[PDB]
């Protein structure tokens, strides 16, 4: 009766047999080749560590996790020590205590002495480990060693005076990141970590580097000295910039968000964060609109009251448009707002509502057709990848890191179709043509053979193809590949479709697909929640444009009425991510100015416009949600789609023989939040 | 430049408004600044000369909300620096009696004109709320009323977007009719009835006048250039008002009569001797304007606007709004 640390679901790959070891007395059961450190963990005792991370390789480098294993000589490094059946582990014996005391003595001997300026002071492992396990007095007077600090782009500044030679950053940058730039060079006490040609680090996950590095040397530049940790509160939310819906924790003080950091979730993003998201808050603070505005006929903007704004918009809506009413659902919006907007429009009678990046074409709706079937976790079990029209390094960076994790674990041949790009794992480039996709759905391109000679293949279609005119042909060619290669078996459904927004899944789920094509052209009253509608341009000269949005930067100069809303860190909505898993964010900081939530503003607009919505509380909104699509109220559990892709094609001729266009560019100026934000702007200016 | 509510009511909530309250040292000034700072808004009060007259309203608000500033009148630079950063301006200045170095005309008319012109200068204001009286055009005695009507006209003219309140006579915890009558009765031979003894007025609860002022101050886009009056909840003759005071003070009423000749011949020497080299006593109950506004009935015009158009009429002048008399 002893629960593991934090709770830790052991695997038991072969549950018929498993060794047992004595940890500090009482026994514990352990799988075949588990390390002494994880055995002690299962037994429920934490061992001090510096150079061991559960996601990177092992290296007996810090020499602090020492324990004594009776039936052995004096010292033993806990990590990298494979457990043996019956070894007599011991952690709190004078031998181990003195070992830890001495090692901490050496570290703090040749450490710098600048805690009260070195942030991570209050979070530092080395600090807490010394205070809890090390001695209380130092005996040292002579001069220490100091090195010069280093620059690694405007994300990770380093005062290398305190690089205690752990090689955590090196092992991360060479295993998970993919780009080999950081490296440990020198000798003896004179040993630094730094790129030898003063280059920068043009990769994501560098924020993950600053989280990995325990002692406060590699630290985020835009969070230079703004706060210690004990000062600010953390709210556990999800992400909306990427499409994976990463699980993060917003650390905020007062009405200001200071930083965001990953939080463990062993199903979506292990413990990492893509570089885009960690620095996406500064502009969320920086640029903002916080008053309902009306365009005065001199082309200017005046701040009006909610009564007047809603009255004028409802009046003109009822006034003119008989059948030409269209509504664009935002790129970063929640199912609540989407269902409220669709209900308001359908009660208005005229319905052309559609999501952000969902194609104007047919875009049939089968959950197995438009969600990533194999969960990201299961993605670690593939053998042959078939990325088509996708650069997952730039979109869904966490899925890219997962694919890299698979290729690192066991070499898995990966074939990629589309434009030239710089993959970081030994990729095969198969061409740029859906014509090649046809040939491989047929017999040429011997890579198809690999599929047939494959166990657990994976075929990943990027959501950028939804906007292409001929999508049913692509999906039908993929269907034929699947049928002929046996990749849809009931044991394993490896036919995945990525996404490149946070609202795309819930939009396609509720059914926001445009009933026609020239909707924006023929319209006269457009209701926007998100920008870009093609170069914000297809809207005609005379058209009532109402931008019910937040953080206005683009298309606002086209808007006719402006309604401020609450960002993704100030409200409670439901976002669905590509594997079909529906999470919910939580409020962290007060709304800015006098903006209101999206479903609230929609319901108020409906009432003042006459036809009202039968619901006026989040509970009834989610009840309507249960009526239209249930998992969205079955939040926080992925509900698979146990129906095949038996769609009906409508092109039946060819795949239009046009190359695959690039779906997302610059990786930072997308996502209006970051775009009107800033650190992403200078990262775009430099780290490219 | 529309302000923004940035709180939840109560003290220490911003709600935007910054108001300069000229005259915020006496009765209506006290009540209105109390209402404003309780709602949550910065207030700048000027005081002519003292160190402790505004001191009380120093406490009716969070830190740095109420600010007493400087010597107010007879200087354009002083008034400007007092209105340096206002959002709204509320004017209540005005006595009920002339003092040699001042005069009804001078104070009311010329100071209203000065305030209007300096607001034009600092044309960054939003609401100019001037409170004058239940007094009409120069169609009535008590030259204060003539000058005050001319001031009403000139402030409407120099500020077409203004609001001029015309409240009736006020009764409250410190008024100038009930307390004088109680003092007079408790002192010696009981009260006089001027004019006839049955002259009609509409006394009004001061807290409710202040609530009307706050209402018209907020009044989201509904009345930005209006000039109207604030009556009371019921018509009161002066005899019946005195009987109300007597029933509430628990004493025996006695009235003095033959009002007009004694009134005129005993209130006229004050002005003469006044303009004749040192200050003279205050008109306890023989005020000329009292004589005039009591010889002419002024109740309600029933014509322009009212409480009913703004907000519900005062509670009643029997239970609470006279409950302050129990001090006797």
């Amino acid at each position: 009766p002893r629960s593991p640390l934090a709770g830790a679901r052991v695997h038991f790959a072969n549950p018929d047999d498993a060794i047992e070891v004595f940890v500090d007395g009482y026994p514990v059961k352990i799988p075949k080749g588990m390390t002494v450190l994880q055995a002690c963990e299962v037994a429920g005792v934490d061992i001090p560590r510096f150079c061991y991370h559960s996601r990177l390789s092992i290296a007996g480098n810090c020499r602090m996790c020492l324990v004594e294993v009776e039936k052995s000589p004096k010292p033993v490094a806990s990590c990298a020590m494979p457990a043996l059946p019956g070894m007599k582990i011991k952690t709190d014996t004078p031998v181990a205590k003195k070992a830890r005391e001495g090692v901490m003595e050496f570290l703090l001997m040749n450490h710098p002495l600048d805690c009260p300026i070195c942030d991570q002071g209050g979070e530092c492992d080395l600090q807490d480990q010394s205070m809890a396990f090390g001695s209380d007095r130092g005996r040292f007077t002579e001069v220490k060693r100091s090195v010069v600090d280093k620059n690694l782009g405007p994300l990770v500044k380093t005062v290398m005076t305190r690089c205690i030679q752990c090689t955590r950053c090196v092992r991360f940058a060479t295993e998970v990141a993919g780009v080999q730039d950081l490296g440990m060079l020198g000798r003896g006490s004179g040993e630094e970590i730094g790129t030898y040609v003063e280059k920068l680090l043009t990769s994501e996950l560098s924020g993950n580097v600053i989280d990995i590095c325990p002692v406060g040397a590699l630290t985020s530049k835009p969070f230079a000295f703004k706060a210690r940790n004990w000062e600010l509160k953390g709210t556990e939310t999800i992400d909306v910039t990427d499409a994976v819906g990463s699980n993060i924790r917003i650390d905020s003080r007062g009405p200001e968000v200071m930083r965001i950091v990953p939080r463990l979730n062993e199903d979506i993003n292990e413990e990492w964060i893509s570089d885009k998201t960690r620095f996406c808050y500064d502009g969320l603070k920086r640029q903002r609109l916080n008053d309902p505005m009306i365009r005065g006929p001199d082309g200017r903007f005046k701040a009006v009251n909610w009564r007047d704004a809603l009255s004028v918009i409802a009046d003109i809506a009822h006034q003119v448009k008989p059948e030409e009413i269209v509504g664009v659902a935002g790129k970063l919006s929640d199912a609540e707002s989407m269902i409220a907007l669709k209900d308001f429009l359908n009660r208005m009678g005229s319905n052309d509502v559609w999501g952000e990046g969902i194609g104007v074409n047919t875009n049939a709706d089968f959950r197995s057709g438009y969600i990533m079937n194999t969960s990201i976790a299961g993605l670690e079990k593939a053998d042959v990848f078939l990325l088509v029209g996708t650069q997952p390094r730039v979109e869904a960076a966490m899925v890219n890191a997962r694919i890299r994790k698979t290729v690192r674990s066991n070499q898995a041949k990966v074939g990629y179709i589309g434009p030239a790009t710089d993959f970081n794992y030994d990729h095969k480039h198969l061409g740029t043509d859906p014509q090649t996709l046809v040939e491989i759905a047929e017999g040429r391109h011997p890579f198809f053979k690999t599929l047939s000679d494959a166990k657990n293949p994976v075929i990943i279609v990027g959501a950028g193809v939804f906007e292409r005119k001929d999508q049913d042909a692509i999906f039908a060619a993929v269907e034929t590949i699947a049928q002929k290669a046996n990749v849809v078996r009931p044991d394993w459904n490896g036919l995945n479709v990525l996404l490149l927004h946070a609202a795309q899944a819930a939009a396609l789920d509720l059914g926001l697909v445009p009933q026609s094509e020239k909707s924006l052209e023929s319209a006269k009253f457009v209701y926007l929640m998100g920008a870009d509608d093609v170069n914000l341009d297809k809207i005609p000269d005379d058209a009532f444009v109402v931008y019910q949005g937040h953080h206005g930067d683009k298309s606002v100069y086209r808007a006719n009425v402006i309604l401020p809303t609450a960002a993704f860190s100030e409200k409670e909505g439901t976002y669905q991510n590509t594997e079909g898993c529906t999470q919910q964010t939580l409020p962290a900081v007060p709304t800015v100015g006098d903006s209101r939530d999206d479903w609230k503003i929609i319901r108020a607009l409906s009432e003042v416009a006459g036809v009202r919505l039968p619901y006026d509380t989040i509970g009834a909104v989610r009840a309507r949600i249960r009526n239209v699509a249930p998992n969205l109220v079955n939040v926080d559990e992925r509900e698979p789609a146990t129906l095949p892709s038996s769609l009906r094609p409508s092109f039946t001729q060819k795949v239009d023989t046009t190359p695959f266009g690039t779906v997302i560019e610059n990786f930072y100026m997308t996502d209006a939040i970051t775009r009107a934000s800033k650190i992403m702007a200078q990262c775009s200016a430099t780290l490219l | 430049g529309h302000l923004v509510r940035k709180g939840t009511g109560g003290r220490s909530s911003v709600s935007g408004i910054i108001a300069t309250v000229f005259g915020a040292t006496g009765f209506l000034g006290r009540y209105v600044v109390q209402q404003l700072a309780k709602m949550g808004s910065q207030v700048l009060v000027p005081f002519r000369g003292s160190e402790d007259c505004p001191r009380h309203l120093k406490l009716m608000g969070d830190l740095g909300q109420i600010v007493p500033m400087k010597y107010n009148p007879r200087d354009e630079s002083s008034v400007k620096a007092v209105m340096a950063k206002a959002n709204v301006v509320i004017n209540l200045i005005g006595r009920d009696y002339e003092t040699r170095n001042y005069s009804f005309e001078e104070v009311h008319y010329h100071m209203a004109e000065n305030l209007a012109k300096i607001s034009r200068e600092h044309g960054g204001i939003l609401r100019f709320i001037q409170v004058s009286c239940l007094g009409a055009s120069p169609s009535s005695p008590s030259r204060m009323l003539r000058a005050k009507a001319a001031a009403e006209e000139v402030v409407l003219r120099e500020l077409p977007e203004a609001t001029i309140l015309k409240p009736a006579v006020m009764i409250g915890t410190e008024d100038r009719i009930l307390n004088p009558w109680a003092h007079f009765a408790k002192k010696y031979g009981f009260i006089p009835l001027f004019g006839n003894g049955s002259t009609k007025i509409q006394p009004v609860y001061v807290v409710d006048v202040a609530a009307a002022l706050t209402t018209v101050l907020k009044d989201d886009g509904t009345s930005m250039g209006k000039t109207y009056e604030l009556g009371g909840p019921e018509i009161f003759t002066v005899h019946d008002l005195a009987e109300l005071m007597y029933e509430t003070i628990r004493e025996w009423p006695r009235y003095v009569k033959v009002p007009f000749p004694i009134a005129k011949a005993l209130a006229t020497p004050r002005e003469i001797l006044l303009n004749k080299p040192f200050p003279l006593p205050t008109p306890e109950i023989l005020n000329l304007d009292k004589i005039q506004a009591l010889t002419t009935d002024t109740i309600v015009s029933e014509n322009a606007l009212t409480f009913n158009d703004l907000g519900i009429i005062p509670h009643k002048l029997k239970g609470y709004p006279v409950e302050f008399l129990i001090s006797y």
Partner: peptide, 15 residues
């Protein structure tokens, strides 16, 4: 009569 939801919505957004 404005369906008191709206009456709250015109005021602050914390109800």
């Amino acid at each position: 009569a404005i369906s008191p939801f709206l009456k709250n919505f015109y005021s602050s957004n914390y109800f």
